[PDB]
Design a protein around this nucleic acid. Sequence first.
RNA 1: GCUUGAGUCUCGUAGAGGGGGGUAGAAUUCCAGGUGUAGCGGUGAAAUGCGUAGAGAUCUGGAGGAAUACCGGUGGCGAAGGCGGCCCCCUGGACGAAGACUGACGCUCAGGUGCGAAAGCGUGGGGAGCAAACAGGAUUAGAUACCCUGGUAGUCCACGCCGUAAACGAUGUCGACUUGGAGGUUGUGCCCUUGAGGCGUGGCUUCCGGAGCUAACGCGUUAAGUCGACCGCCUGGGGAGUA
RNA 2: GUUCCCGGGCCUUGUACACACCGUAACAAGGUAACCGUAGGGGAACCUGCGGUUGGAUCACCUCCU
Lengths: 88, 129, 49, 65, 65, 218
Amino acid sequence: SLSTEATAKIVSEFGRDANDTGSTEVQVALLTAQINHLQGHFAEHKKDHHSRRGLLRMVSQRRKLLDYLKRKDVARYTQLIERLGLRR
Amino acid sequence: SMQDPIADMLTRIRNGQAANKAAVTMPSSKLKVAIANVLKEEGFIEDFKVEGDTKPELELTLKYFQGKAVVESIQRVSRPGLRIYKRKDELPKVMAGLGIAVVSTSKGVMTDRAARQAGLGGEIICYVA
Amino acid sequence: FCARIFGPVKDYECLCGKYKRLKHRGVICEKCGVEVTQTKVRRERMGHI
Amino acid sequence: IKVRENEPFDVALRRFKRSCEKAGVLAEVRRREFYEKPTTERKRAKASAVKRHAKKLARENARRT
Amino acid sequence: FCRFTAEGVQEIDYKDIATLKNYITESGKIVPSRITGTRAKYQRQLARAIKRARYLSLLPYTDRH
Amino acid sequence: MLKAGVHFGHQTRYWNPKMKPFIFGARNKVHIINLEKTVPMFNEALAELNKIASRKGKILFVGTKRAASEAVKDAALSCDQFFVNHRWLGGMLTNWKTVRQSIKRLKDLETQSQDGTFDKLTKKEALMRTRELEKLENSLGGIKDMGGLPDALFVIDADHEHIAIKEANNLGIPVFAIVDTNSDPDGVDFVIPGNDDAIRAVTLYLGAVAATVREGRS
RNA sequence: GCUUGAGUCUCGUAGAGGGGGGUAGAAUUCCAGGUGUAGCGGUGAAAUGCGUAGAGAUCUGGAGGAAUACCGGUGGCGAAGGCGGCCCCCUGGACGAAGACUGACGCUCAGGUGCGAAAGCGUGGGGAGCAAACAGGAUUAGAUACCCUGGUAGUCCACGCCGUAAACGAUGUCGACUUGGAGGUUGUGCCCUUGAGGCGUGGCUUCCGGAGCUAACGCGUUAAGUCGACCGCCUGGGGAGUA
RNA sequence: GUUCCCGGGCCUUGUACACACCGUAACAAGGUAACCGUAGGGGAACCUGCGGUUGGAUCACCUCCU
């Protein structure tokens, strides 16, 4: 269930506080962190007709979150894609 | 999901009379409060309370007659999907007058008769009987 | 030691337990007459043979 | 399972065997599986298991016979 | 109604089996969460621990094979 | 003082509290107090029990359940009212028009016994007029000579005799029904909530109704 | 620009949830050995078969194979389908006490994509039990039908294809609103968890009922009650959910 | 004495029945409960195996502990 002493390091970087993980720039990164440790499962085992609903779920959530940041703050979005590299 | 405040507020009115209460409280906006202003002058609402801090709790005291609803047959006509404009002479009357056709006019909030007083129409929000 | 012959085992308490209401006063157990009154009065319940 | 009792019997005493299962697992591993069957019959069984308690609630309020 | 589930808090262990004798019969049969005045949580966790006590030879399966 | 503090008729949880509002009251292991709605609702009760009597009114007492079944017979004999201490037969207000067929039958039996042929027939049949007439006592003796409708009916129960309340809503006649908090707020005109299955309330409420009839005619 | 909407983190729990592999024990088919009998099996009844070439039965050792009695609870997980030993690793989803924020980032659909019990088949292995086609004896005027003994396909492990259902609490989905009781299952905050609890809040599910709907039965906070948003379907049956 | 046997009544359960009890596969539990989905087969209904549901029936007797 998540890797706490890696993700807390992430909120330390992106956040202006330690309690501030409500800003778009920090939350999508914690979401990508989930995906960084999710690759480890979608590489092996092959028969996850259950774990598949998690993929489509968190990817949908992520696609539209960066889809709003794009429509409002291009300052934070271009800095965000340049801060984590979540574009590719 | 509570996208049309007006309609799901009239439900608090509908089921409110069916559940027999005395006071309803819904998220506020002074446009809805202006509707209650018109309703007090007519006798549908009694003493509207615009109490608010940072989370606007408009508290409206529901009125009865002889232990019966004065506002019983009420529903939405100009839906959030089907918003329909009306003129001044094609304008409808709830209960042919024994009820008010609440219309949002070019000035603020009034009735079918008060819209005749303005000489201009608009959104017949709902049929109030 | 009977409720039908004398009275409520407890204050307004029926023999069978049909009346576990300390509001019930007078109404008897229709099976056998248990007029519910305070059990303390059973220190004054006079019967006969 | 194993009943003994050194002397006061004058009887076989297999009452804990029946009090164990006896026909409990006999009726379950003697004939065809048919995975779904018990589920349905426990259905009619459960509704009739609440029915006697419904009869317990049916005897407490009136019965002024 | 018993002074043991009024002092029984947080997962009853699998080491000494003296109190496991108090949930099983002297046959190797477990008592359901309804007979024993114990919430399913507890009667069930005690149970899983007992299967592990079988992989450890604390309690056998049925009495005799 | 609140009548030795009994007014509140303890409320049994399974009471299903629609009446929850009006009752208020504390909650003791089951629940319990019907407070307010009970106490001051009798003052306005006294008011109407005076006015319907000012229009010449009688109270057909409708009581069952063995507890008040005794003061019903006495509170009726205490003033001038008719009573139903025994079983309140379903139809004694609506089907009463056809109960009248038997009322004329009862008034003809009262004839044969008093000034009839209770000494001009087989002892076998004379006793038939005897045992049956006593069945007319427990059934129709408290309405033997009505003719006209009473102006108010005292309904001892709603939790059990809501039908007695329903048939009243067929004549639209004043109902002075005492209730429990699993009953309907409709049908009753002057509700007197709270305790009703208490011998003390029997003395208290029923006596205060017959006595209030006594001053409307005065 | 501001928050009652959506969402994530700090701090935690439970689980027939899925996935790859390995392992424990009983029973069964069968093999070797000591003992031993003439019956075992089956059905309303008979019979095929086995039997002095010693079956069934008992004890010890053991190799394939599939599946987990008792714990089991109109209980739990999930989009649904569907799914009951244990361990190691991976991991999705649901929920909660107290705070921090961008500030409606929300809902759904033709073409499209993915899951898909069981079955059919191709392929490297397999066959204990049951058992399509079929054979023997009977019920029968007849058996390709209830029954029993055998038995190919299938069942299982891994990769794919046609891509189907009573895929049905028959109740489409996101969400708000609408007197209670018996409960069950899983967490949490407050008070002395002295104690088997009292007061509130979310998820799933069952029974009796008010409001309301209804042809009626009844559903009834998980609705068939009240609205808004998005899609599919129907115009009597059959033809046919087929060429 | 009502447990055996013939006829009768009341209550109750059940029905696609009310025109009203070549082979029985459904309607009483039709003496083998039903239907959908799939493969195969036989003059033919339907049956066999696997998954699901209730648009299914009685829970009445005979032996043991308080």
